[PDB]
Write a protein that binds this ligand. Structure first.
Ligand SMILES: N[C@@H](CCS)C(=O)O
Length: 559
């Protein structure tokens, strides 16, 4: 009934109260069935629980659909009841809510993404799309993805939701353990930096921990996003009693935390497992009528994988090896769809110090798009690090970006209006950063020409508001082709002085001469001394890597 603009306006005016738990409430009514099944077998019980929260003051209630997606329902022999389960839930919740807000509630499938599990991004996406379609038809005021443990599954859920409706208010949540990490390794800063730039409306945290434990996790999340914030702690950390799970936190002890969350900018406050109507009644009295606080998010240039956030505040080694160029074996094996060869290359590079991996697929018309989609989804889990997606075709790029688990680095756009716009639009939609190569149709042959491309790039980036999401590659040319490297060093120094990160395709300097290792090392050292932030390079070049380390120590950037 209400769209995202209306909900956003309401949130800007006041902090809202969500509801408590459902799964932990149904047993008290004598129903221990799967919660979702009650929508068909005992809708009266579902209505009573919703009413219990509405009568306690909740401004928003969640539909009884946490496990209502085909992949999850299938595990309970209910996949064929998806439609009645979801439709009945929305109707029941609407009847209880009256004019209060009803958010469609979707939890994770319990299936890990390949290669941890067997599921590809495309299947999670279709799974969530079908449930969202039903909710939008039935009239929800928003959709909340609760309790997610993996960023790829959550990215698929939010992208599917946004494809169904550009108008529905969307909230994405992850649940974090006591160490502040999701099941597949994502910390709050990574979660916020990755999702803040997707077209969702709010981010939040629910479950796993109590209000005291979530506070620092919530604080970290709040510092990295300017989107609305939601929190639903369990009523204390789960503890086992005379047989099973109990949430011990009483109403007063839970409610005293509201102030601390309000100060961190919370927009919607509620409770998860263990929270009861008695808790919600007191939250209502304590919250009262408050206008949300303003926040200023920390700006940062970082890329991520599920378990690693790589911030460009130190020199970043980007492994160049997954590139079939001049590697006839690798080229052959990729055309046939070999994953294990590419996986071996990734792990060895990381072992030697690569913090990010460049991934290129040679003559793209020659490769199976499905293969690009699977490699892109796989490497961040098995090698642990973020990727620099080195792709030429716009269509293939879109496919790689939609399925990338984290915030990627996209390996390059030249300074060409059209090329930049297309790459930026894909990045704005799927998230990510961009390497901008300082050349146009032709290669520049001086510092001055490169500075002009830099300025033209800045004009274009300003126009699409994307200036904070780029790293500049001055364009290293082969020495044997009058590459004039002093001109590139000058450019690096200049870009660094302007506050922008830089990178170079290091090996291009020497790929046509003997002793290339020595030229690459000399140039790297010189480039770092001028401010070079990173480089796509061979991490298996021991001289190169050892001299790199020595340089960082000497320049006091590490020891
Ligand atoms: N909204 C769900 C969350 C389960 S983690 C419930 O209250 O049961």
């Amino acid at each position: 009934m209400r769209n995202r603009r209306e909900v956003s306006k309401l949130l800007s005016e006041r902090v809202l109260l969500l509801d408590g738990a459902y799964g932990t409430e149904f047993m008290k009514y004598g129903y221990d069935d799967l919660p979702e099944e009650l929508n068909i077998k005992a809708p009266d019980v579902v209505l009573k629980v919703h009413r219990s929260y509405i009568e306690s003051g909740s401004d928003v209630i969640l539909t009884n659909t946490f496990g209502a997606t085909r992949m999850k329902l299938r595990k309970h022999g209910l996949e064929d009841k998806l439609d009645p389960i979801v439709r009945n839930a929305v109707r029941i919740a609407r009847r209880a809510a009256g004019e209060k807000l009803v958010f469609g509630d979707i939890g994770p499938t319990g299936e890990l993404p390949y290669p941890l599990g067997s599921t590809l991004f495309e299947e999670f996406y279709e799974n969530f799309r079908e449930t969202v379609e039903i909710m939008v038809e039935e009239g929800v005021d928003g959709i909340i993805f609760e309790t997610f443990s993996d960023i790829l599954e959550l990215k698929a859920a939010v992208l599917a939701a946004r494809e169904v409706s550009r108008d529905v208010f969307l909230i994405a949540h992850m649940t974090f353990d006591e160490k502040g990490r999701s099941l597949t390794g994502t910390d709050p800063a990574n979660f916020a930096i990755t999702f803040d730039e997707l077209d969702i409306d709010a981010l939040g945290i629910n479950c796993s921990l109590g209000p005291e434990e979530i506070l620092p996790i919530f604080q970290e999340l709040s510092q990295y996003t300017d989107k609305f914030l939601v929190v639903e702690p369990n009523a204390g950390k789960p503890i086992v009693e005379n047989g099973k799970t109990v949430y011990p936190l009483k109403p007063h002890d839970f409610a005293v935390h509201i102030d601390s969350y309000y100060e961190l900018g919370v927009n919607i406050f509620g409770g998860c497992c263990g929270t009861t109507p008695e808790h919600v009644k007191l939250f209502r009295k304590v919250l009262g009528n408050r206008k949300p606080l303003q926040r200023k998010k920390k700006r940062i240039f970082a890329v991520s994988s599920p378990s690693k956030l790589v911030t460009f505040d130190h020199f970043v080694v980007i492994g160049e090896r997954i590139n079939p160029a001049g590697r006839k074996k690798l080229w052959a094996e990729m055309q046939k769809g070999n994953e294990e060869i590419v996986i071996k290359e990734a792990k060895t590079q990381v072992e030697k110090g690569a913090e990010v991996l460049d991934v290129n697929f040679g003559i793209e018309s020659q490769i199976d798009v499905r293969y690009v989609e699977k490699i892109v989804q796989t490497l961040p889990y098995v090698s642990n690090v973020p990727l620099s997606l080195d792709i030429q075709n716009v269509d293939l790029t879109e496919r790689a970006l939609r399925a990338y688990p984290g915030r990627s680095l996209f390996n390059s756009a030249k300074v060409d209006e059209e090329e930049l716009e297309m790459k930026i639009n894909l990045l704005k939609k799927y998230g990510g950063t961009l390497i901008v190569l300082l050349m146009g149709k032709d290669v520049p042959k001086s510092f001055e020409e490169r500075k002009e491309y830099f300025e033209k790039a800045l004009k274009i980036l300003e126009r699409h508001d994307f200036s904070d999401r780029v790293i500049f590659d001055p364009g290293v040319l082969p020495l044997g082709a009058e590459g004039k490297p002093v001109e590139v060093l000058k450019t690096i120094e200049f870009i660094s002085s302007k506050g922008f990160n830089t990178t170079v395709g290091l090996s291009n300097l020497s790929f046509g001469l003997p002793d290339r290792s020595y030229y690459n090392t000399a140039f790297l050292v010189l480039g770092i001394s001028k401010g070079l932030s990173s480089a796509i390079m061979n991490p298996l070049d021991e001289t190169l890597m050892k001299t790199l380390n020595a340089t960082l120590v000497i320049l006091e950037k590490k020891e």
